[model samples]
Target chain A: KPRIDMHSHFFPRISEQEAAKFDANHAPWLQVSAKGDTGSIMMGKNNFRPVYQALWDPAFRIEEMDAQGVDVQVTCATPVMFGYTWEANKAAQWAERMNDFALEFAAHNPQRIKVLAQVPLQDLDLACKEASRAVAAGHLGIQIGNHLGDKDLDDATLEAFLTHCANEDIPILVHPWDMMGGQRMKKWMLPWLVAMPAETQLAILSLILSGAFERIPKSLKICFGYGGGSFAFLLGRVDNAWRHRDIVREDCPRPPSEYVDRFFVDSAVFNPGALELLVSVMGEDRVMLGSDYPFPLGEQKIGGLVLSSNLGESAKDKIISGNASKFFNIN
Target chain B: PRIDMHSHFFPRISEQEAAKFDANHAPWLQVSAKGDTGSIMMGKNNFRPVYQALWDPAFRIEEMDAQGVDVQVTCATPVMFGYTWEANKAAQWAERMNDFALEFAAHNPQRIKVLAQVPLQDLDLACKEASRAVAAGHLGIQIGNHLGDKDLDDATLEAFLTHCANEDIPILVHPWDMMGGQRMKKWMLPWLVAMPAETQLAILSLILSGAFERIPKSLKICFGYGGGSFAFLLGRVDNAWRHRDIVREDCPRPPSEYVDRFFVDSAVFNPGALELLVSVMGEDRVMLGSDYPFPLGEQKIGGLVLSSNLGESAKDKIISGNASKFFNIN
Candidate 1:
């Protein structure tokens, strides 16, 4: 079985002339500056981070993947490109460009790469339309933020889009952006370290509590980054609260744990013990290999931790590749 | 053999007496009756419908028997402590609440145990009330996750915690005034989501702030709702503390080092979750807790513990043995 990494990120290397095509007034202007193989990606006065040649260079990324023993990598645009704040039409156009870039890049090494489509989730109609377009354009699935500005995953307007994804048999990869409590927890990178996971948990709870899982088709493949962002760990509390509180119990038909096995989680949680708990809660089949690759915060060696875990070889094999193959319907 | 460490009771006050307090004040409570059951209204919400079980010892024991619970350690509803009120009024309320708990426990000493309430807004008053409650045979006290914006680890609480440690009074930390704000306006998101997060903030504040280091070793603490998702997230917390200098500047050790210093309850309903709780916190530190008298708590009582994959010995410990040890029950 091939070891498929489901949570890696990618950026297209843009030359000065190529970068000039992007309008600075555009909501997510791709301001790229390269000098001596190092570059930076900035958007609207926020310097996202310094970028390396490997970000846009598929050759370099493949080389790194080879070094890490990864057989294939499923890539998506960095979450900064989500641009939920942009005008719906502009955001849709931006998503098209990003998805087109990703698709074109994946075509270079089709066997070794898969791409997830990006959509402007702020508008349900545009989001559904773009999801269909991306799938038709040979994308494996679509990636979405945990929320659309103030709207949560369970927001009613998004139901049509979620149902569309389900109907099209494309997975929805939920990543965190626009995190909650960032203002108060601004220090120590707590926004990413603490609030990110908390935000993801909130999104998952919103889905479960709002009966989205039950209302949507059971076959809707939803995957969460950061080991379902504390959801697996906190399912106990969710179940307890669901059982105890009328607000939770009345909203959902069954216990929160009943829905645990339904959603998928990537093995991006750093600790082996935490990963073990995630597998135990989410099950081996629901876990896929994910290494927020090319990011400092993701797993350093990709599948190294899962491979080294004391879990059975079969479980490890499933996490390393078997699960992703099944999730993306790859042989 | 099941002993529920996390159950609640309220003092029965006449309608006229209840009306004495300012209705608009913080810790505002509106009590009214519909036949035998009473409604304790908080703000626009009916906190919970109360019945004889809240104050009537015989009724509570009967309900306990039905649920297969042999004993119950009752504490004041976190709202009753009213730490948000004026120091004097809150202290007076604390004394009355403690007295009511004492009377209830006095009625059925063997089956019911009492944990007092203290006006945590004022440390001096808290110490005095804690001392008085313990003298009146209370095991410990129940406190909210925070006093206003101040966390459990706030310096102001140190003296009170020290007093509890010195006096051998354990604390049952509960969550109140949840964190949702306007975002969590519907579906009781505040109770389901924010409350657990609040409880986690309480546990983490205690651990990360070195509150455990300052308090005497004799100070035993228990958290409601299974330590509010703390044990599951400890690995991440420890990892962050190790990697980030900002998180490490605090007094002592890795966040997980403080895990064993506190106890957690089996209020978490899923068997797998309870098993994880056992694995993380150890069987000795896990006790049975049913947030009884409220509709949202464990209706089946010991069902989760009984059905868990844990060994019979472990189940016994969670169901009764741990409570005996923690509360000094023979």
Candidate 2:
């Protein structure tokens, strides 16, 4: 029972074609391809390669996983869906197109590839529709960015989407997209380095304060991507703030820890000691493997790292595959 | 009592002179300054000067009291001193900074101690600086960015690090002024976000570069001024090393194995992050930091440090005791 990468990404064939078209159209304005046409394309300020090229390329991924012994790879589109202007009809169409592409890919590779569906979050009705469709089509989960375009995750727009996710019993994979303010692009503050953690922190904070977890009870499970920066470190702070503020938790039926327990984290953190610390904070059962495949910073050999961890065999089994398999209903 | 492991203060007079010198010498013409004159001076680049005065010992004592810190150990100027400078110049300035820090601490024995300075790119100079600083009652020595102005696997830095190991002077490394182009800049993005990870990266590179394997394990190294982010990023880096494990040009060690050898400061702003830092790096590897006088992200020393769940043993070790042992605080 080796580990499964809950947070690994892959691009569906149609999505890859669309992304290439998008890149071809937008290449001139981006600083990405001007220097080198070989790397991933930049959509808005962030990088997005034609999904297939990034997901399948040995140079980009796969071979590294072979060495690491990661058995199953889950995939999702980059949160480019959030960059769109959400005008109901347009948003609905975008969600269908993206979810259709993801569902098709996961259907073809049922055992190996899992899809984390992307929704056009600017329109709440469309988001709920897409979540229901993706889950019905056997998509493992739905991926939402830290923010829903201009709206925070806990806003009213997410109410229907969260309800749908709860009904489907599919996890909501929340990853950082871009920094809320346009401040991340000023210098070397690339999204992965800077924006990723900032967005994750903001999203988590909103979820805690906005009472999203409280509203849904433990039915809606959330997963934070990109090691979620100081989340494991700041669990105490968030709980304390919840207690002191008496905003979200006061009226809720359960204590704040119950909400925290429902959240899952991936081991995208770059260090062993850091992974050990996260496990200590959240417990291995609540954590899973996330390689961030197709990115330069992601771990290629996930299995080796897990095997080498100081965590016991049972804990390792839980983080590697057991937790993700249960979370996604992966048979 | 709270004890901060990472904090900063810029001397007004020393900084102004350096900025003027940078304006004249460097090809980059415009010198960026932080806020108004009253706002603390900070360097625009490695060459720019941010502080104007040599910080008086009492200024340190006053800031510590203000921050509710009982004691603070000061380190030398960061990349502003320039380790990538030509060998002779780097050596000379390294010695001067070492002497200056010693003198500063001498005047405020109760409130302050100092981690000395070294010309880290020059091995012989680094050895000399380490020896002298140790002899003169300085606790440790400071090094600039792991990747110097040059490439990552530079031999000169390795040699200097070796000298530090030999002299038993724990090097308190600080990130350089820049990162890989825009991904690493003086702006909050790279400096705040990437610096922590990159500082950890550099240390990892040093470990993977076989510096740790080559040297004795007793080499006591510490990092400051936003290095706490390393502990958090260490997990990801180790995963990358394990998975996409690339052997860069005959580099002889595995990056993941050497994480426990170094130490990090509790400079990360929040208390939960500090507790996680303890969880990752262990209580023994953490130390208190105030970053004393620098205005940006400054913490109230004792109050800020003690506020975290550092437990009594951790509190005792990190606050005044660990540093005391590391630097021979007696």
Candidate 3:
């Protein structure tokens, strides 16, 4: 009954000494001579606290785990880092800072917590180096976002790093971040709710179509977040796209569902019925427990939530703990 | 002033008449049929009496109590009847149904209001019905998830919907029985789960197609049945539409900006969840709905509004006041 939550996040404390330096030497917004909009800059400051701190505290996360009877935690960076469109270096440094902070916190409670390294994917080579270093430091694996700038996870340049993770048998936890283009930010329907599922769907389709799944084959397990977003239902659309677009089918082995086994899924889906449906579609063995932690209520109520579901005990165990334990060597 | 934007009632007298016509047309109508065909339903048998008691009026004050409900705008049931092809016959039946519902409100004066009905497949009839319904005291019209047995995105329906929009009546839409049939029934996913998903898809397709943008903002439209959980699914689908070229090629507006012109109801079955909804969509665009004559209990119906973590102003506006202003109820 050891539950391993594969999706958790934390932000840096910005040491008191570094805080002054960060404000004076490295504030990206401050350095920009012409402010695009004063109102937006002020709004960003007001919105900064929740994004930077409360959502990523270890104590806050552990408390959430305790509420849900989750025995182990696998943490990663929040998708907000992808919000930046300028200064790849600043984004990279932020990734490293958060990773170092997570490393220290995970070490404090090694029995209950583990870290997934974040690479400043904007800098691909540096991203690969960080991925190697983190795995060497006993991290679970590298967590790549759904999109980097305009490039998706299956984009060619990221393949080398993905292959490295595959060689080491480290799984890639693909969480969704915002798209670089601000189109989704428009309507209530477009970005906030739709973005997560669509990102996962697009990435999965790209991976399947671009033969990234074929290239990596079984190298590294891909854990898709948000129930992999409509993948279970949109099977026909993807197949139809592949069939009609002759070029897309140029290099593939089997259909999309054939490679589904290569992908692992997390249980961040909101409702129990949805979770049960996910299990029914993806099979319990390929699904893992993931409570996006430290966000108001982490998977604090996940066990009870799953228990209340219609899933049988066996399926419940796999989604809550067993599948993750097998994937992460938690046992 | 309190408002209940979404309400349903069999209208015993109207049911008796529709039943006579229905017997010759749709056997499916018998499923909810009350009494051996002779006995239609009363206000008590339908959702109105119960909801009127449990929520809106607090103490059943007959006549759409202006004190309790400044306006009680109602929508037609999304019956699985639009699939039929006999355009003239269907349009005549639609006109009769629209008149019946519109007159139901006309009799009640300032208390009750109506959104008309149209056989969506026939464009001329749909537009004529919109003009006629508006002329007959109806503010808007209702559409089902699909038109002429096709999803709303099909070109014919798009053209028909455009005509309806041009006529200036907002389209209030909801789900119908799955026309997808036996294959869809096996998973039980179609009616129970897919219904909401389909509604979301239909609305997304409509918004992404620039249906809202092409029409003027003066035309007010509200989605029915608590917006069918469409609000939650909006972000993901619209996000995909933005990054992917899924929308119609001719669409000029970004899917998001145009979609805001649409409105939703607080019928999502929970109050705490309402906070999330209002947070995402804002309160001004939401309205109070009680799928009243449906099966949901009065307490359960009111619980959806009362339990919401939204501020009192938002709760009041969504539960009653918003519908009042939107529909110009009293």
Candidate 4:
């Protein structure tokens, strides 16, 4: 009966006055919709998007989840709330505030809610501290953006934080944010469409190409977004480079795809064929039910795509709820 | 049973003959004979070594027969596309290259179909030469995915595409001077990685730029390299179209809605990939394509199409039926 959604988002509600306390110029504030059914989140003067109450209200979210047959939801802050651009001290405070907000949401609905901690990865010490801090405070795992400023997942300074998560049994959901090409690809929401996946691909490639996976502990469990962002489908091409060029294999002992099983992916891809492709390449078990819920860009009805997918029933069962439990080491 | 829809031909010219042209601006092939096989040199640099199959139809047909391929649609090698060159010179080279392919096809008309090259830099020349090549019995037009900085969406190129459609010339899009290759230059990553992305972008750009909508009702187009991860990442584009006004500003429908308008090759190299490609693009829109004589290409033409778990009907369509209908070669 347990159908867990491995991906969903929450944004700690902040008022104009509350936002003004910190980075007023950049802190997130809300513009409630006219009917009051949805709230438009503002990143300073810009209109980011209109989100449903489920992004802030646990009761509304759980009721919606119950109707959708989702028994459990693994939640993290929306990428907008990442605070990667903020200074360390303020970002650390926001991380604790955001982390506590999730704990507070899961306070009574513990069985139905699981939380992933946010980190100010622009500051590695703070990234490590809060990840360690959040796990102890009922957060099930950690979620971080694909990159810190211009530094990728394999940033030279990321080794300590990576080792911390690895040694601490923390799983990572590498979400894409501050997406690459944001300034240039304004049309087509390409910042999210092309740039998000591109950022994740760049992150995944950085790890493999920079030999992070080889040197990092084997226990590090990282999951990439958007079917690993064209990486899985392009595996044959990427691997061919490894075979033909010495530079590709310099840091990498073998082809980048050799590390495919070393990570997991969320099933937010919108179609059965896409899901089947994702399952075929990542292995069914490595794929989890992800809807990117409560956002227009997110897939609707959570695990319904998996239900209607061409994947085998056994594979579907694991993706729906089984793997998330095993992956996150949930109770 | 099989047709190799994806392959290249080189126009052999002696170095002394090439001396008439400015070497700095033009690309010329320098060859050293090794029996029937020879090396294709670009100025002082060796571009790629080749078997006689690239230039000699006799040698090419021998290899095709050995591989069990009944037909081969020949086109110019990407090296000579010269979209970044002067318009007049590029058009001149393209016309000469078209003649070579046309003459080569004349040897065995039934066994050969030609997809010629054009100068895409000058819209008028591109449009004019396109019709000329088609009139000269070049079955279709083959072009680089983009013209230097311009994608298929360029306003200038739009007229060229329209002319091709008006002339009933089919199109084969190949990646050349690929964008985003500056970083992956160390490895042959451009050919391996960036090439596919280029095709995908070309397809997406056509849809996003509304070129697909503007082109005369129908223009048969097939993309090299299985449309280069286009089908796989289409969800991202379609979702953007659905949710963003800017994305659909030019294209009225979501990217997925235009699936039947285009075609892709069967060189995805994996059953899972091929299955996904078919599921998205449909069996009718996928044809046999083998980048023959390239190491990364399938060893036996239609090898994957014959080996995959695809049903016989779908298999037959991709193996040769799709190519026959798409190219009007039957």
Better of 1 and 2 by TM-score: 1
Q: Which 10-residue span in candidate 3 chain B carries the lowest summed lDDT? A: B47-56
Residue B227 accuracy (lDDT) in model 2: 54
Residue-wise C-alpha lDDT for candidate 1, range A261-319, written one tens digit per residue: 67898888776777888888888888898988776556767788898877899999999
Q: What lDDT tens digits, residue by residue, belong to model 2 across residues A120-225?
A: 7776667777777777787778887776554656666666677677876878888777553243232222334434564575566556555667676567777888
lDDT of 1 at B78: 66
For each candidate, the DockQ is 0.31, 0.10, 0.03, 0.35
Q: lDDT tens string, model 2, B107-170? A: 7765666777676666676787788877788767766664355445567766776777777777
lDDT of each: 0.77, 0.60, 0.60, 0.79
- The ten-residue window of minimal lDDT in model 2 chain A covers A26-35
In angstroms, give how far residue B144 of model 4 lies from its true place.
Answer: 2.4
Q: What TM-score would chain B receive for each of the candidates shown?
A: 0.93, 0.79, 0.77, 0.94
Model 3 B-chain TM: 0.77
**Weakest lDDT window of 10 consecutive positions for candidate 1 chain A:** A19-28
lDDT (Cα, 0-100) at A269 in candidate 3? 63
Q: lDDT: which is higher, 2 or 4? A: 4
Ranking by DockQ: 4, 1, 2, 3
Better of 1 and 4 by TM-score: 4
How far residue A319's Cα lies from its native spot in candidate 2, in Å, is 11
Interface root-mean-square deviation of model 3 in angstroms is 14.9
Q: Residue B278 deviation, candidate 2, in Å?
A: 2.4
Evaluate model 3: give its lDDT.
Answer: 0.60
